Amino acid sequence: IQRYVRKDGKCNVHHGNVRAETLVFSTHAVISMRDGKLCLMFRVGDLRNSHIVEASIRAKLIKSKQTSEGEFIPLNQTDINVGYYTGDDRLFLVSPLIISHEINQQSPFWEISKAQLPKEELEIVVILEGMVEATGMTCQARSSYITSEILWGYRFTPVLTLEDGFYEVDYNSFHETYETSTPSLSAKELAELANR
Amino acid sequence: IQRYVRKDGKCNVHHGNVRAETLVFSTHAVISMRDGKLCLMFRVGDLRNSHIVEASIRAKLIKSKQTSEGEFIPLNQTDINVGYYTGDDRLFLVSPLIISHEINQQSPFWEISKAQLPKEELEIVVILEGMVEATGMTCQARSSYITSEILWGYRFTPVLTLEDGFYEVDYNSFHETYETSTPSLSAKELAELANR
Amino acid sequence: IQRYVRKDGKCNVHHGNVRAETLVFSTHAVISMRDGKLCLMFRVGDLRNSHIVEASIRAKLIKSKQTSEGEFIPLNQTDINVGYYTGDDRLFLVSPLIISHEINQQSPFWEISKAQLPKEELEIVVILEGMVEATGMTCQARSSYITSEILWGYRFTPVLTLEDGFYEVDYNSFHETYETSTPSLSAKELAELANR
Amino acid sequence: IQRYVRKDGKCNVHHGNVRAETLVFSTHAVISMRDGKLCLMFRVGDLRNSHIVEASIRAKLIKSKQTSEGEFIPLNQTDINVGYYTGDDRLFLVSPLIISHEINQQSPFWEISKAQLPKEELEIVVILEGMVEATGMTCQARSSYITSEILWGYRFTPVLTLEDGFYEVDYNSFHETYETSTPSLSAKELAELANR
Numbered sequence: 001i002q003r004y005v006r007k008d009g010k011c012n013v014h015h016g017n018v019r020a021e022t023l024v025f026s027t028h029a030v031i032s033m034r035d036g037k038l039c040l041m042f043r044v045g046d047l048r049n050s051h052i053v054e055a056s057i058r059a060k061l062i063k064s065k066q067t068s069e070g071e072f073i074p075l076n077q078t079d080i081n082v083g084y085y086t087g088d089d090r091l092f093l094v095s096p097l098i099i100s101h102e103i104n105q106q107s108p109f110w111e112i113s114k115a116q117l118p119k120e121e122l123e124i125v126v127i128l129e130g131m132v133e134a135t136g137m138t139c140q141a142r143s144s145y146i147t148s149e150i151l152w153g154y155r156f157t158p159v160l161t162l163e164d165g166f167y168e169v170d171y172n173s174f175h176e177t178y179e180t181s182t183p184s185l186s187a188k189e190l191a192e193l194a195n196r
Numbered sequence: 197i198q199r200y201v202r203k204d205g206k207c208n209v210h211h212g213n214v215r216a217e218t219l220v221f222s223t224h225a226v227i228s229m230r231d232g233k234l235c236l237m238f239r240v241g242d243l244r245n246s247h248i249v250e251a252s253i254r255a256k257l258i259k260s261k262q263t264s265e266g267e268f269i270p271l272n273q274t275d276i277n278v279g280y281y282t283g284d285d286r287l288f289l290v291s292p293l294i295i296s297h298e299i300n301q302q303s304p305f306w307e308i309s310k311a312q313l314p315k316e317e318l319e320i321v322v323i324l325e326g327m328v329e330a331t332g333m334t335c336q337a338r339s340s341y342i343t344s345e346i347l348w349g350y351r352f353t354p355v356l357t358l359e360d361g362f363y364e365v366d367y368n369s370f371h372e373t374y375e376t377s378t379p380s381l382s383a384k385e386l387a388e389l390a391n392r
Numbered sequence: 393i394q395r396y397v398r399k400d401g402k403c404n405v406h407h408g409n410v411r412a413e414t415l416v417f418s419t420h421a422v423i424s425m426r427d428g429k430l431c432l433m434f435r436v437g438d439l440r441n442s443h444i445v446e447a448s449i450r451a452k453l454i455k456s457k458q459t460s461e462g463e464f465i466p467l468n469q470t471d472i473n474v475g476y477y478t479g480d481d482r483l484f485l486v487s488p489l490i491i492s493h494e495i496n497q498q499s500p501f502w503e504i505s506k507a508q509l510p511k512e513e514l515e516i517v518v519i520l521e522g523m524v525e526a527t528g529m530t531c532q533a534r535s536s537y538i539t540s541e542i543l544w545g546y547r548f549t550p551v552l553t554l555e556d557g558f559y560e561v562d563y564n565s566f567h568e569t570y571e572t573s574t575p576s577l578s579a580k581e582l583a584e585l586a587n588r
Numbered sequence: 589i590q591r592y593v594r595k596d597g598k599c600n601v602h603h604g605n606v607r608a609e610t611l612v613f614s615t616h617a618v619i620s621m622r623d624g625k626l627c628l629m630f631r632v633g634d635l636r637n638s639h640i641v642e643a644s645i646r647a648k649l650i651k652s653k654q655t656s657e658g659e660f661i662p663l664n665q666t667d668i669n670v671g672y673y674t675g676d677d678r679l680f681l682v683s684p685l686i687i688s689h690e691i692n693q694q695s696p697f698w699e700i701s702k703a704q705l706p707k708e709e710l711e712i713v714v715i716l717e718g719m720v721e722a723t724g725m726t727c728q729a730r731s732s733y734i735t736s737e738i739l740w741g742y743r744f745t746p747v748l749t750l751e752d753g754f755y756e757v758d759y760n761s762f763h764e765t766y767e768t769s770t771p772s773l774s775a776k777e778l779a780e781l782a783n784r
């Protein structure tokens with residue numbers, strides 16, 4: 001068994017690194033099943049030459065909306081769940097990670113089907129915040145997913161592989177995704193059906 | 197569909213900005229319905245020339261009170277819910293936002309009607325805390341709503357409008373509110389009645 | 393109605409202040425009823441000449457203990473609830489505040505009566521943490537309550553009074569407490585009895 | 589009764605200290621019962637010559653996994669519960685502490701027996717984060733537990749002892765553990781059996 005993090009705390013990634021380089025978000029988000037739950041996923045990249053401490057991910061849905069009392073909220077924001085309640089939004093960023101929001105009754109995608117997706121006018125903002133170990137200062141990195149950039153029925157290609165006692169990242173496959181067999185029913189629709 | 201935040205993370209607000217200017221709270225709070233829930237709302241302004249990171253909103257009710265055992269607490273504080281449990285108090289401040297506290301069984305306004313409001317002796321303190329991206333240092337901004345400054349049955353005028361691929365803020369309408377048809381029963385009273 | 397915090401965010405306490413002075417904890421803790429709940433309370437002082445931002449209170453019970461499998465833990469620590477779940481541990485420190493932990497089924501005092509208190513070998517550590525507005529740096533202040541310093545059946549004297557449009561703190565009464573009629577049954581005992 | 593923390597806030601540990609020295613994690617983790625619950629425990633060391641403020645512990649399970657839809661996640665991360673929900677991950681680090689994760693239905697060890705443990709291919713990453721009082725800057729310390737370093741049926745030797753009004757740490761016993769009678773059934777298996 002080859003360790004990921006060594007006893008002294010030094011990780012075993014990017015052979016020979018030094019732990020202004022920018023953090024990266026995959027250009028596309030994917031929707032697909034993970035153990036019977038439909039999921040939205042995007043990938044967040046590491047910083048090749050330093051750790052990010054007290055590092056956390058959060059996501060906002062920007063969507064103009066009308067309240068049942070006729071109040072129109074242009075570009076209304078609402079939180080997307082990405083591990084807040086279990087501390088799974090508290091990231092150990094030492095190689096690109098796939099973040100995952102389970103599309104459940106409380107998720108803003110609960111009733112969005114495959115066909116219905118392209119019709120929607122919405123934007124997912126992805127926001128990484130941490131303190132850069134080296135610099136000492138608190139960072140923030142942002143990016144955005146519009147409808148047309150969320151791919152229904154795909155999965156992220158794996159970028160991690162074990163080479164020579166070290167773990168190495170194929171950063172060419174970072175943004176890379178493949179298709180997978182995935183129902184086109186909305187999570188609600190899937191749940192309704194499973195419930196009989 | 198015009199993006200709000202671009203792929204690189206730069207937002208599309210305040211054409212040609214630079215991302216000591218003060219943050220702003222609307223001078224008035226409003227109470228009115230949002231999808232069947234009575235709500236207290238105040239508006240919190242952005243910082244025209246920098247982001248605020250790890251930015252969060254919280255609110256305190258200052259109200260002198262007597263305990264059933266005759267203990268009098270002058271200016272007692274208690275937390276007003278403004279998205280703490282869902283991370284919706286964790287703000288993405290890139291244009292003035294309306295903050296909203298749903299007046300429910302756990303809210304200090306649960307039993308306050310319209311008529312009963314002006315009678316009350318209370319103060320809502322609004323407290324924004326974040327780290328200013330540029331400066332590096334942690335900010336705090338405060339303001340206050342006394343009874344006479346909470347307007348029953350109003351809504352905030354919209355300040356956001358899409359001009360020339362950019363989003364622009366009509367800051368003249370910032371503090372601006374209009375009236376809307378809103379029941380004058382207390383949330384409790386509304387709930388009691390709906391529950392038959 | 394005289395405001396506590398003004399529109400611009402400046403508070404109306406300590407007429408003519410400047411917003412290394414030390415933060416203070418009352419020398420004694422008290423136990424007594426607040427609306428039918430038995431409560432432990434200690435008082436935490438403000439900083440006469442600056443705000444504390446992102447300010448929070450937490451408390452630890454230090455108590456040596458034996459596990460049912462005969463494992464002895466000298467000075468075991470366990471968290472005392474002082475508003476963590478509702479954000480009421482997130483303090484707006486602009487004048488001495490009484491902190492309050494409701495002694496419930498989950499509290500380490502649940503079964504401790506008045507008579508039984510002096511018998512106990514325990515210590516409450518009180519820990520204030522915030523960033524000092526002026527200095528820029530994160531502070532921590534600590535203090536400690538041993539058995540003999542928790543007073544059963546007392547309440548904290550009020551220190552707040554309204555003088556000349558300003559609110560003024562009688563710091564002589566800070567540590568001051570008076571007695572009040574308070575049952576000597578343990579919270580459990582009180583609950584058992586009330587439950588018939 | 590000898591105090592642990594004095595009225596002024598100065599602790600009574602490491603007689604005559606000064607409050608780049610490294611923080612320490614015990615080289616081994618142990619699994620054993622604590623009041624009827626099976627538990628994983630590792631020990632986290634203090635910093636002999638300074639406090640760590642806003643100090644917190646978190647743990648990640650690194651484990652390559654396959655989703656029921658055949659998606660393979662190399663080195664998947666998932667949060668181990670170590671007091672997040674009760675604020676018990678918010679540490680008062682003034683002498684080595686034993687951290688403890690109760691192996692319950694939500695824990696990744698729920699179904700892992702004693703025999704089954706050595707078969708498993710998994711790694712627990714332990715991550716301490718706090719601000720170093722003196723330095724002013726935010727620290728992070730890491731270490732790692734692979735299968736072969738988690739000891740089933742052991743307990744950590746005590747390192748705390750009261751010498752001359754001061755508390756002293758036998759740092760030789762830090763990594764020291766002894767065996768204890770401990771069932772070899774998995775937590776699930778223990779729970780199933782207890783439930784009849």
Ligand SMILES: [Gd]
Pocket residue numbers: none
């Ligand atoms: Gd912080």
Ligand SMILES: [Gd]
Pocket residue numbers: 173176
């Ligand atoms: Gd490829």
Ligand SMILES: [Gd]
Pocket residue numbers: 369372
């Ligand atoms: Gd207007």
Ligand SMILES: [Gd]
Pocket residue numbers: 565568
């Ligand atoms: Gd007095």
Ligand SMILES: [Gd]
Pocket residue numbers: 761764
């Ligand atoms: Gd020994």
